């Protein structure tokens, strides 16, 4: 699924790309498109709050059904499409009633396949059930943390989670991180794994392509001045010269845990990543 | 696969003669019959019998053994081989064991002993030596 | 081709529930281009070793003749999903 470019130029040298064979339709659905202006890591105050975000190709936001709450009505997959806003591909699925929606395209989803959601749904890829209904040992994705909110976990390309066990109201799941956590059985998850598995393997190849994706350059703290970074200053190249590597904002950045204490999720989490 | 029928005939006789078998049966061909008849004529083999098997026929050669279980045929050698064919002119016709042995030769006249070939002044392919 | 299928149902299952299960699965066995030649319930038997913390189980044997293995594969998928069927095996011969 990866296309390896020949070394015609030094820029193209070592550059690889996805074949995009899976994509069936190259045009988005007009009805499910909404505008998505770029923020470039700038908040309401207008100041830069997250660095290295800016520019990039314009993108229209595609509306997606993470909830998968339409139950008892079968949907046929019209197309698999490229979404600029996510690593995964999206599937235009037309319900029997005639509603057209986008969903995160599961791996092995095909045009003309039927997908259903609900407790009574069969355990086949593209089907969204409450976790309780889903059997143990099943790979699942688009998992809702809160019931009815919509799936928030395992939405990325080549992402899945495995149902491990049932514990009363909660169900135990192992996340891709390796975390084992309890989720309410009422919460839903789609059967299967997200596709576009080869997304990670892509070699961007050149600086300009990173700029197309809206990533602005990263300057190291070592090559800054003392006023700019804790790592700044020094004559010539310098070693860290401190007990640990530090963030730009003067916080230790290697090994130092940052998860907030006294969180309700701590009881839900059984095993860390 | 079998590549030389004649060589097999000579070898069968040799193998049988070693174990002093009275008779041997072999697949029959016209050339092999002619060789057999010559051997009987020279007294190397006692008798030859031919039968029709509805395929190519079967030859039965009766080996001759002297008193004290002596063997009349000391040895057989295939002079001309499928890999390399040996042809000799009448002047160059070989003598086996200083004339004590016989050399089977295929000639325009027919398959004959070396002595006959020299007599008629007709050269031929040297099939084998028997002594 | 003729296939013989044996499925063990959990001992704690209700008699009404067991009847619904056997009926469903026997349908699955004859779903696609298949005829059930016979279906026989061995009934509750002591398991030689404990399976899913059950020392006993209901054995059901079904014989199915089909040109394709689609029905048997369908049975196997649903049997794996089903909590009731603790053990199942499909044998051609």
């Amino acid at each position: 699924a990866i296309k390896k470019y020949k070394p015609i130029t030094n820029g193209r040298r070592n550059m690889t790309s996805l074949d995009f064979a899976e994509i069936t339709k190259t045009t988005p659905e007009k009805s499910l498109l909404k505008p998505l202006p770029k923020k470039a890591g700038r908040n309401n105050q207008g100041k830069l709050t997250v660095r290295h975000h800016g520019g990039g190709h314009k993108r229209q936001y595609r509306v997606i059904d993470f909830k998968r709450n339409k139950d008892g009505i079968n949907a046929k997959v019209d197309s698999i499409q490229y979404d600029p806003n996510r690593s995964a591909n999206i599937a235009l699925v037309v319900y029997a009633d005639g509603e057209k929606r986008y969903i995160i395209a599961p791996k092995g989803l095909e045009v003309g396949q039927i997908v259903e959601s609900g407790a009574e749904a069969d355990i086949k890829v593209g089907n969204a059930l409450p976790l309780q209904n889903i059997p143990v040992g099943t790979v699942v994705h688009n998992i809702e943390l809160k019931p009815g909110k919509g799936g928030q976990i395992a939405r990325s390309a080549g992402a899945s989670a495995q149902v491990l066990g049932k514990e009363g109201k909660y169900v135990l799941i192992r996340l891709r991180s390796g975390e084992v956590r309890m989720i309410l059985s009422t919460c839903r998850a789609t059967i299967g794994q997200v596709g576009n598995l080869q997304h990670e393997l892509v070699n961007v190849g050149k600086a300009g392509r990173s700029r197309w994706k809206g990533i602005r350059p990263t300057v190291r703290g070592s090559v800054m001045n003392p006023n700019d970074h804790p790592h700044g200053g020094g004559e010539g190249r310098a070693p860290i010269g401190r007990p640990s590597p530090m963030s730009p904002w003067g916080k230790p950045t290697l090994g130092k845990k940052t998860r907030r204490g006294k969180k309700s999720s701590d009881k839900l989490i059984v095993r860390g990543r | 696969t079998m590549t030389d029928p004649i060589a097999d005939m000579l070898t069968r006789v040799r193998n049988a003669n070693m174990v002093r078998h009275e008779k041997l049966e072999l697949p029959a061909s016209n050339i092999k019959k002619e060789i057999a008849e010559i051997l009987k004529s020279e007294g190397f083999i006692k008798n030859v019998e031919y039968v029709e098997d509805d395929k190519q026929g079967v030859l039965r050669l009766f080996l001759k053994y002297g008193q004290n279980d002596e063997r009349v045929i000391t040895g057989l050698k295939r002079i001309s081989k499928p890999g390399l064919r040996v042809y000799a002119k009448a002047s160059e016709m070989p003598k086996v064991l200083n004339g004590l042995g016989i050399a089977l030769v295929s000639t325009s006249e027919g398959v004959i002993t070396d002595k006959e070939a020299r007599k008629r002044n007709v050269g031929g392919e040297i099939i084998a030596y028997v002594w | 081709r003729t296939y013989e299928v044996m499925y063990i149902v959990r001992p704690n299952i209700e008699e009404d529930a067991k009847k619904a299960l056997v009926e469903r699965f026997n349908g699955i066995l004859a779903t696609e281009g298949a005829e059930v030649l016979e279906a026989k319930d061995w009934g509750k038997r002591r398991l030689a070793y404990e399976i899913n913390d059950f020392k006993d189980g209901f054995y059901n044997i079904v014989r199915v003749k089909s040109d394709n293995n689609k029905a048997t594969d369908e049975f196997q998928r649903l049997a794996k999903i089903s909590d009731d069927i603790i053990r199942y095996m499909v044998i051609r011969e």
Binding site: - | - | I8, L47, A48, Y49, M89
Partner: protein
């Protein structure tokens, strides 16, 4: 000895036929050697496939 299967003229061993299989398994549940049983080579192979299938279905004990 003599092969039971040959003597009784039975050409098929069934995993469902527990009682037949039980004779040729040890008290530990180990498959008995063909020499001790006196079974023929062909039938010893059939017996093992039958024993292993029955063990899967919990008709016969592994141990």
């Amino acid at each position: 000895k003599v092969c039971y299967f040959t003597a009784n003229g039975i050409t098929h061993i069934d995993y469902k036929d527990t009682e037949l299989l039980k004779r040729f398994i040890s008290e530990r549940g180990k498959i008995l050697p063909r020499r001790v049983t006196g079974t023929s080579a062909k039938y010893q192979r059939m017996l093992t496939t039958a024993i292993k299938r029955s063990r899967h279905m919990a008709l016969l004990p592994y141990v």
